[PDB]
Fold this protein.
Amino acid sequence: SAASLWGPYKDIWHKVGLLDKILKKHKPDFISLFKNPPKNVQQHEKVQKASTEGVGTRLLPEQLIKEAFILSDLFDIGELAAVELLLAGEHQQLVAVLLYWDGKRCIANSLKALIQSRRPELASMTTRFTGLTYKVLTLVSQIDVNNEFEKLQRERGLGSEKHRKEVSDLIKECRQSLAESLFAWACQSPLGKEDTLLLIGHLERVSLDAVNLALLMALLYCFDISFIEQKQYIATIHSRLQDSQLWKLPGLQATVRLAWALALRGISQLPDVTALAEFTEADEAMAELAIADNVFLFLMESVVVSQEEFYIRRVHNLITDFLALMPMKVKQLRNRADEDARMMGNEPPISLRRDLEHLMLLIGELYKKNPELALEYWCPTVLSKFVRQMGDLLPPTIYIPYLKMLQGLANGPQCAHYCFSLLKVNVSWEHFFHSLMLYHEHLRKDLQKEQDGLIAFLQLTSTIITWSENARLALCETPVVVILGLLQCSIPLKAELLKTLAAFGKSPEIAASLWQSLEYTILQTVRIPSGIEVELNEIESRCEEYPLTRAFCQLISTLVESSFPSNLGAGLRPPGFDPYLQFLRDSVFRFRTRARAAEKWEVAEVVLEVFYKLLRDYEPQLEDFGEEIIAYKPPGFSLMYHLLNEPMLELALSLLEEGVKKHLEKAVQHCLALLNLTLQKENLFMDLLRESQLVCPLEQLLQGINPKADNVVNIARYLYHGNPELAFESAKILCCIS
Amino acid sequence: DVGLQAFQERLNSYKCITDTLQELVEAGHHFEQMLKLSQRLFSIALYNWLIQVDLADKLLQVASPFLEPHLVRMAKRYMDLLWRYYEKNRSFSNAARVLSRLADMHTEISLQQRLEYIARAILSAEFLHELEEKMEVARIQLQIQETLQRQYSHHSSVQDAVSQLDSELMDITKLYGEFADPFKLAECKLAIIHCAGYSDPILVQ
């Protein structure tokens, strides 16, 4: 039998983290599976007597009996084994359950450590039975066998989700640990093709299953190291796969096979192999068939969706291999795509031929946020070649993903720099600019295809500009003028455009140019009489839709930071920044009634940030420790003015009442900080600032804060919280209020 | 160790002997020669050869003095060896002791068989003491098992209980606390306490 106890496995593992041949020699327990004992009726009678024996014996009480019974039912496990599990672990409430999973957890891990880590006598010992290799696939299947769901269905009535999730977690990790083991074997290079075919079949049994990804770490490297497998075997698989092109349903197999071909080309470039095969029949025809059989979508899907190291590295190798070895195919597809469309196309018709673009997306998704990998494209001037080639595919459909793909590449501040150089030096940024301008002209003169291209266009510009530094200024000079013009036209893109323009926004004095644009763009069509609302209408008319507003808020937020020039809007209307804040009233006031919650926080956060900045946007200490005009101009005045309004303070207050993604938490911090600042300088506003400019008094705010109790209570509760910003500030507020 | 090489070498020769034996199939003169030879690795190997062939029934016939130790050592698809063994023992006592162990054994064997072993073992009638108690406890599980079928409180998927029941003899307390009380089999509980011989009138009442 095997030791059902968790402790030996744990200790052995720590040792290796020392390895004692003696404990390891215990050996086969690293079976993985608890294949032989399932729930046994015979075992129950033995157990019920309350006397049980282990493979000494113990008296078993009624309480223990129940825990043991629950285990057998829950995990279809033998009753006696279940007992040993309880004995080994401290008896507490469902302790046996824990040992059950723990036993498996390290056993898998140890096998993983040995096979992956070690090159060695022991590695040989574990593998030698050639028990582990047989078991690996079955171990995976064991995880799969639907026990949990049936119970849930039966359970639906009195459901216990929590206990289930516990099980689900342990199993998922087990599958993950299993993935490393399979991969390790591949590096270990077991003997041959038979395993691969069995494995391919095994995976195939599973197309929507996310689980497939776990296997993606075994197959790819395996194909990568085709050399290890004996030529006799490689040749057989080659033939096997070709015949195998059927599989219209198995998308996954088609993709895996396609990958094999990608690898084969490199391997075949040994004179023995290469000479024998005919290129057209041997490689191109089948590969082409695979692409037709949706091989690309599959690869993209894996990329899109998502042992990270083995997966990322190995997949990266596949993607790169694809680029270098494959380009004949790429060109073939490219030409194919250009010709197919003819000047009513449904999206599905557009997408059919789109396989090349899908490749581009595959790159974008895989590389994104991985600067380590992304850099390779730009490090030396094939990947680099690849970009150049991609750059030259003119059709808008390909042109667009091209822009997107690069953006993914641009991620590191460092890479962003290269991207900057790519357009600037070795398509150019200006051409990019020109295209944007051209669309602007066409749209205005007229008064999805464009949206697709334009959306990508903006997406790329935005990505680089944010990450870059001084380049930002240069980019400011080609895109700012065109960027402004585009926004004027009505597009569904305006929001996106504002986001990009905001990215350009420079911290310095230099900012004034952008302010002119924005003011010109709310005021341009405005009929402003002497009411205040008239000014509000100006903005509301222009910023008709939500995306427009979101974009607007982002742009304003950037601009406000050490914001603006004097006498803004001079000549057009009454001057000053103030009308902008009033507009916020429109937003913030019907924020609470926002039909999506995610969207709700999306808008609320920027406003809070601007709110806070504005408060900071004055130096109160100078007084505490052209003046009149300066005091008139700062936004702090208007901000305080509105804050005093009860929809404004109330909204801010509820944020505090209802606290806790982590993103939401930030909103909370701002809420508190904002209130603290107000309290600190409430007095300054009332007595210093207000008279200078001059509208109404303070009282409503205090009763809402000091008298609302819950706010006081909630803040008190916050002090305990470990965010220091929230706690530290919460503490301060009560002080000010008191 | 003592040197493995000798072992590997002989086996080849042994395989040759077995290989030749197979070809024979005047058959008897050839076989008796092999058996009537003094070589305990040879015979042990021969038997192993026989089991693979499923020649095992023939094994019962072999007189060889080597055979008895062979069965004994191998005794713990060994069950066939044991079905062989109790049958092998003409003697009642020895046969019974084995079937008892057969029943008690930890490899999955149905209770029906476990009982058939006991029925057989009992027929061959302190060993007796253990055997009879066993029969009694086993019977209880059969009853509990039977009721489980009738009971509608049970779920088919919780088959595990039956597996446990058929799988082995269980502790009386285990049977009582785990099965009788939770499944409210009062009759079973009562019978069980009979065997236990629990006198306490209050609890019994």
The radius of gyration of chain A is 33 Å. The longest strand of chain A covers residues 51-53.
